[PDB]
Amino acid sequence: TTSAGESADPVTTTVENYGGETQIQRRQHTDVSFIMDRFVKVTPQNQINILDLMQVPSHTLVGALLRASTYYFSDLEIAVKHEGDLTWVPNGAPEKALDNTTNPTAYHKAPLTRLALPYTAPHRVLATVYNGECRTLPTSFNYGAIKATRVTELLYRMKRAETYCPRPLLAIHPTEARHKQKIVAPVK
Amino acid sequence: DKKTTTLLEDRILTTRNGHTTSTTQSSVGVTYGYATAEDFVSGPNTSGLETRVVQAERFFKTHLFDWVTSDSFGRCHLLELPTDHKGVYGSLTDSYAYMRNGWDVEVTAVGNQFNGGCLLVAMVPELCSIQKRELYQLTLFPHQFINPRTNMTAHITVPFVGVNRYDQYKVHKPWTLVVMVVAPLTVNTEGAPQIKVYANIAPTNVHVAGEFPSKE
Amino acid sequence: DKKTTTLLEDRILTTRNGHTTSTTQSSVGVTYGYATAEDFVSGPNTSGLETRVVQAERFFKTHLFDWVTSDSFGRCHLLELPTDHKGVYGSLTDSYAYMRNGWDVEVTAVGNQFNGGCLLVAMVPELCSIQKRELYQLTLFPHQFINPRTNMTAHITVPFVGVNRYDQYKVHKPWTLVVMVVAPLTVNTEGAPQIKVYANIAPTNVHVAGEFPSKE
Amino acid sequence: GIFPVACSDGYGGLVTTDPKTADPVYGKVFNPPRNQLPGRFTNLLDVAEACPTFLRFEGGVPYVTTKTDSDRVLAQFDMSLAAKHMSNTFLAGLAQYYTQYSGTINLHFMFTGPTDAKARYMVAYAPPGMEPPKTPEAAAHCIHAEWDTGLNSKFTFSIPYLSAADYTYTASDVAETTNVQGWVCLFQITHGKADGDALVVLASAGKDFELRLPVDARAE
Amino acid sequence: SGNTGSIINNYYMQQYQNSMDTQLGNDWFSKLASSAFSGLFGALLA
Amino acid sequence: SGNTGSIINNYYMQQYQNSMDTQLGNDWFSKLASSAFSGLFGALLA
Amino acid sequence: SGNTGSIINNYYMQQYQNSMDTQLGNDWFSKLASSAFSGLFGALLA
């Protein structure tokens, strides 16, 4: 169909235009809450680690999709491999609090510690970008912090995720006509 | 255009903001971005002390840039909002600590119908800078195109957005108006030689809270 | 035109033949020649052995000629139908001894609205050649004009015709598409320098009978 | 057969704030009765609302005294639960154990001069973003209240919660040079023979004051 | 009550899980806070 | 909701398992996609 | 069905335990075996 292209009103033609038939679609895998709900690894600091989803690398599935939203909300689960006991403090806590074990402290139990944590920021939602300094995000954009004698692995998992105002999501720029890769296949 | 010789029909739109009006005979409609109304204006962060200031809800103007034949795809002009304002809205930012408002934005690029080329105008939240590849997806944001064979005016209306219900505009700018060249300007023999791009903007639903002391 | 600036309104027509479509924004309507439906497709000459082949009912394309300022009144281009066809319709002519079909014909002459001059497009039965004086009466046949100030597309739809209910296309061509210059092309200062004329044609109600042996 | 279960990795370690209870080992203990004992409190903020405690001013005293200058500022301090002026209050003592707060904080001013001493005062709340006012005239443009002395010796005023976010931090960060929540400014408009008289100041939690997110942050 | 959050019943009887309270023969600060004067003591204008 | 698939009730109360949302005083892109024009703008032939 | 023998309900939803089948718009060998001729083709004596 033709239309006024200057308008942002979406136009979605279908194959029925030339005699085809539109099929049924099942889009559960592109549901935001479902797709963000899985663990992703970040490289940890030795002891004190601020819980900040922007640490998730931008090329990962979770990191790229998170960056494709401007504002977001979620609760969180973390899985941590650590020596010693692990202490968590909420958003707004003095860093010294990390040495006091009345703050949620999980005693070491092999092979790792998994915890469910609530959102604790003072804002109604957080943002992946913030036009203040025109990089740096306000200090209040975090889910608290953790500390152990040694933290060797740290995974984040967004729960009940909500996203607002989509932003660019980019695939790899290929050099040839098509980006080609080795796909899994039965052997020789 | 979906209307009917020269710029016409149900393509004539008059917008009124306060005691200021703007009429265009080549409208392509209005793009509402993200919502068609504001969310709650009275929350706990202002303790019922906020008020609306209707006198600030009116059009103010600025020149953006001059579109010339040498500009190529991707050439952009960014305008962070709020911007300098020497009228009533601007004085509010020096009188109250917290504020919120949406924007009613009109961008015009007046050449003639013998020019060719195309501009994309978009309102983008939290935007300081953007990469070249990301420009291919600027249409994810509230936008409208200006294509000389069809129109000279783009109109986008957006609500206040932000991690906070009220803002401190001296340190944060939630919206950035971006105008980008999609296809280079062509002049041929009868087109205008260049096109000056102007913005006519009105703050909407202006609320303020936290009166400041005077400098006295 | 009877519609409403540039090529528009109820002058936008989309034609669909099979899995192929063609849209024009400067339609002047469709001329139905001689009938608005086919006569009987099952008569005694095929003994109930004919079948319809819907897969052949779709658009195919050819260039006709280039209309230039030096062509004068009476300059014609003739295209006998059926013509060479390298798709499904063409293979039918090598697979069955007898066939019949009508034609849905679209002829375009795209210059711009600053060109002047006029073409007459007509579908003429049983036409091998025509004399100069007879051209003054080409309007007796199903036709439409292409006049740059108004349109770029002519559309004529005709049924199968003939002394026989089914034909042997290898030896007889019932229809000839003719495009004739009525008033010479003018370019002036802003018109296109010449206009290439193209045809977009679809066989309609295609029936075949009498399967041939293979060459094997 | 028997019921199969998956003993899950990542679960089961002792957590100091966990929501479950330990297994018991010594049952059937009945306690001496303690019903109707006086003075019970079940929420720390009930105590914070009902019992105002003293502010601390220069010199380590809970009052400011009438000035006889051209300088009319009695006190100006950061609206912060970590401010030195609030440091001996029950409110600050409670706030150090939570990371965020919201709502109203009430200030109380009690005049203690003799019957023949009169004065007129002004309290103003100056929001962040501009330097605090140095004079009553500049402060008039802020939210404020003026009152004078008489039969009733006390005046109470609510400092409003105004902020971009819904909650603010109780602690103050080493990087924040100017107080993020503004200032409380107390001025003396004028006085009649009140030289040297003391205006005692106290603070209590307001009706919608709220503390959230417990935290144990002291090293000593 | 307290910092406890299991939805399922305790496996042990109450008599074992906690000491049992007895009665002979009441939130003072809650009443005190609720009783606070919140008005205005004289006449109000405008 | 999300990537969760147990049929039995969570052992912990909701108040502990997640933060609790509050309300003051809505899927924009779903409405936008649903509103898309899917027709044909002029006359259709055959 | 299959080599499974627990009497109690699976802890995980079906949507997670297995892929879900869909339908568009049948045991051939069982029908074929059932259709087998089992009689006698001519006359029977004694």
Swiss-Prot record, chain D:
It is found in: Virion; Host cytoplasm. Forms an icosahedral capsid of pseudo T=3 symmetry with capsid proteins VP0 and VP3. The capsid is composed of 60 copies of each capsid protein organized in the form of twelve pentamers and encloses the viral positive strand RNA genome. Upon acidifcation in the endosome, dissociates into pentamers. This is Capsid protein VP3. The lineage of its organism: Viruses, Riboviria, Orthornavirae, Pisuviricota, Pisoniviricetes. The chain holds residues 505 to 724 of 2332 of the full protein.
